[PDB]
Design an enzyme around this catalytic site. Structure first.
Site, PDB file in Angstrom:
ATOM      1  N   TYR A   1       1.344  -0.907   0.020  1.00  0.00           N
ATOM      2  CA  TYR A   1       0.157  -0.342   0.071  1.00  0.00           C
ATOM      3  C   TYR A   1       0.473   1.371  -0.115  1.00  0.00           C
ATOM      4  O   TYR A   1       1.763   1.568  -0.011  1.00  0.00           O
ATOM      5  CB  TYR A   1      -0.950   0.018   1.194  1.00  0.00           C
ATOM      6  N   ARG A   3      -6.702   2.920   3.323  1.00  0.00           N
ATOM      7  CA  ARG A   3      -7.005   1.195   3.339  1.00  0.00           C
ATOM      8  C   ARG A   3      -6.577   0.038   3.507  1.00  0.00           C
ATOM      9  O   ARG A   3      -7.204  -1.039   3.934  1.00  0.00           O
ATOM     10  CB  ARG A   3      -7.763   1.197   2.359  1.00  0.00           C
ATOM     11  N   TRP A  15     -11.494  11.963  -1.126  1.00  0.00           N
ATOM     12  CA  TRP A  15      -9.872  12.266  -1.221  1.00  0.00           C
ATOM     13  C   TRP A  15      -9.022  12.642  -2.340  1.00  0.00           C
ATOM     14  O   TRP A  15      -7.681  12.935  -1.523  1.00  0.00           O
ATOM     15  CB  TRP A  15      -9.455  10.493  -0.765  1.00  0.00           C
TER      16      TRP A  15
HETATM   17  N1  LIG Z   1     -12.160  -0.839  -2.460  1.00  0.00           N
HETATM   18  C1  LIG Z   1     -11.079  -0.707  -2.999  1.00  0.00           C
HETATM   19  C2  LIG Z   1     -10.408   0.404  -3.188  1.00  0.00           C
HETATM   20  C3  LIG Z   1      -9.325  -0.073  -3.506  1.00  0.00           C
HETATM   21  C4  LIG Z   1      -8.898   1.842  -3.620  1.00  0.00           C
HETATM   22  O1  LIG Z   1      -9.855   2.665  -4.304  1.00  0.00           O
HETATM   23  N2  LIG Z   1      -7.650   1.973  -3.730  1.00  0.00           N
HETATM   24  C5  LIG Z   1      -6.998   3.375  -4.215  1.00  0.00           C
HETATM   25  C6  LIG Z   1      -5.595   3.713  -3.166  1.00  0.00           C
HETATM   26  S1  LIG Z   1      -7.014   4.123  -1.299  1.00  0.00           S
HETATM   27  C7  LIG Z   1      -6.117   3.471  -5.042  1.00  0.00           C
HETATM   28  O2  LIG Z   1      -5.584   2.118  -5.964  1.00  0.00           O
HETATM   29  N3  LIG Z   1      -6.119   4.255  -6.143  1.00  0.00           N
HETATM   30  C8  LIG Z   1      -5.744   5.528  -7.308  1.00  0.00           C
HETATM   31  C9  LIG Z   1      -5.095   4.319  -8.239  1.00  0.00           C
HETATM   32  O3  LIG Z   1      -5.966   3.571  -8.782  1.00  0.00           O
HETATM   33  O4  LIG Z   1      -4.136   4.890  -9.005  1.00  0.00           O
HETATM   34  C10 LIG Z   1     -10.331  -1.060  -1.269  1.00  0.00           C
HETATM   35  O5  LIG Z   1     -11.081  -1.116  -0.038  1.00  0.00           O
HETATM   36  O6  LIG Z   1      -9.619  -2.122  -1.449  1.00  0.00           O
END
Ligand SMILES: N[C@@H](CCC(=O)N[C@@H](CS)C(=O)NCC(=O)O)C(=O)O
Ligand SMILES: Cc1cc(-c2csc(Nc3ccc(C(=O)O)c(O)c3)n2)ccc1F
Ligand SMILES: N[C@@H](CCC(=O)N[C@@H](CS)C(=O)NCC(=O)O)C(=O)O
Ligand SMILES: [Mg+2]
Lengths: 198, 198
Positions: free
Chosen positions: A7, A13, A103
């Site tokens: 992460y 998360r 966010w």
């Molecule tokens: N519901 C999913 C949400 C996952 C998610 O949207 N992760 C984000 C980080 S908080 C992410 O990788 N977004 C940035 C991207 O896709 O490049 C979970 O709880 O794992």
């Protein structure tokens, strides 16, 4: 098993999974990446999102799917299948609410206004619902701590960064946060973990 | 066990529960309410949202929490603990996307626009992730049908109302939809159910 969590350098998360490992005394590599390592790692991911957990080379995704996986057959999961359902329900209710926050919003003013709207209206509403659901009982579900209590402390910790007086009128929910934070394995983790704003 | 499901007169978030009740040949009252009767029921609820499922005098909530509870110890659950994690992960991926839709947007122009954006810019990428993930396998998870397969079929069914060409480049995904639709209990329910848009 051999566990590797990936992460950002953030509670976010991933934190719910970190608490579970800590409480269940399960060893794992807590790999935190910086933005620069993301495009590189993202392209290897079946769904392009973090966190992910690799268990003996097999990759798992979705934070709550993973958290549920880790609590399977432990008291953290909920004592009966009915309780497990209430645990799952409380967890999604909280997750549905946190997902309401922009966010990623690049426009600082929009972000501020949206946060303020959610914290002025939706948050105190959700808070009355959680407070009333908890009642004068010890934990959210059943008579022992579950990962829903964990999730509550985790979600509220983040909401409190933005609206510090959010629980000023909810002593029962503040008490719940303190009970969770005081669990030895959790108290230990909270002290060792990297300090980050989110 | 008496079961009473309450939701609006639509597939929406209640449909996954309905497919599971059908597949497992469980009888329940399928309570569908009108929008004008909603406020009075909403006010009486712990978390003010539907669907809800009443069993023996206790009101469960969260569609996936409930779906997961009904499928515990059944053949619709994953066959391994890890498979149960993948079932959960795929359901949350699908759910994260469907949740982005402003289903209850009053301003029709803003709603149409947000819908167009998501369907046109995001949906195609999800279909790519899912198609690659399925690969040449018969079901999303393992060797037998899981409630993840039902949820895929349910989500894809509503996306196809708005974007009929969504799966033109995804024959393996249409084959999966058709496979779910062919399960006798599912086939029966699909033929029998009230025909609504959403
Ligand atoms: N519901 C999913 C949400 C996952 C998610 O949207 N992760 C984000 C980080 S908080 C992410 O990788 N977004 C940035 C991207 O896709 O490049 C979970 O709880 O794992
Ligand atoms: C499978 C799946 C379905 C839905 C869904 C379709 S319609 C609706 N809710 C609506 C739609 C319209 C209205 C309304 O404005 O009357 C409402 O109150 C609620 N929700 C959402 C997520 C999901 F994963
Ligand atoms: N994640 C929840 C979403 C529940 C939800 O927001 N339901 C909507 C209808 S689909 C609702 O109760 N809306 C009416 C309202 O919020 O007043 C679930 O899966 O049950
Ligand atoms: Mg969710």
């Amino acid at each position: 098993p051999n566990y590797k969590l990936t992460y950002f350098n953030m509670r976010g998360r991933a934190e719910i999974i970190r608490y579970i490992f800590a409480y269940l005394d399960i060893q794992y590599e807590d790999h935190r990446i910086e933005q620069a390592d993301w495009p590189e790692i993202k392209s290897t991911l079946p769904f392009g999102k973090i966190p992910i957990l690799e268990v003996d080379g097999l990759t798992l995704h979705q934070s709550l799917a993973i958290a549920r996986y880790l609590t399977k057959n432990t008291d953290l999961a909920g004592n009966t299948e009915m309780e497990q359902c209430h645990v799952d329900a409380i967890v999604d209710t909280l997750d549905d609410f946190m997902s309401c926050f922009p966010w990623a919003e690049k426009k600082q003013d929009v972000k501020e206004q949206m946060f303020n709207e959610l914290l002025t209206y939706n948050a105190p509403h959700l808070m009355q619902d959680l407070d009333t659901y908890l009642g004068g009982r010890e934990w959210l579900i059943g008579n022992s701590v579950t990962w829903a209590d964990f999730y509550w402390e985790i979600c509220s910790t983040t909401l409190l960064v933005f609206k510090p007086d959010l629980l000023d009128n909810h002593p029962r929910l503040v008490t719940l946060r303190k009970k969770v934070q005081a669990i030895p394995a959790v108290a230990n983790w909270i002290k060792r973990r990297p300090q980050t704003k989110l």
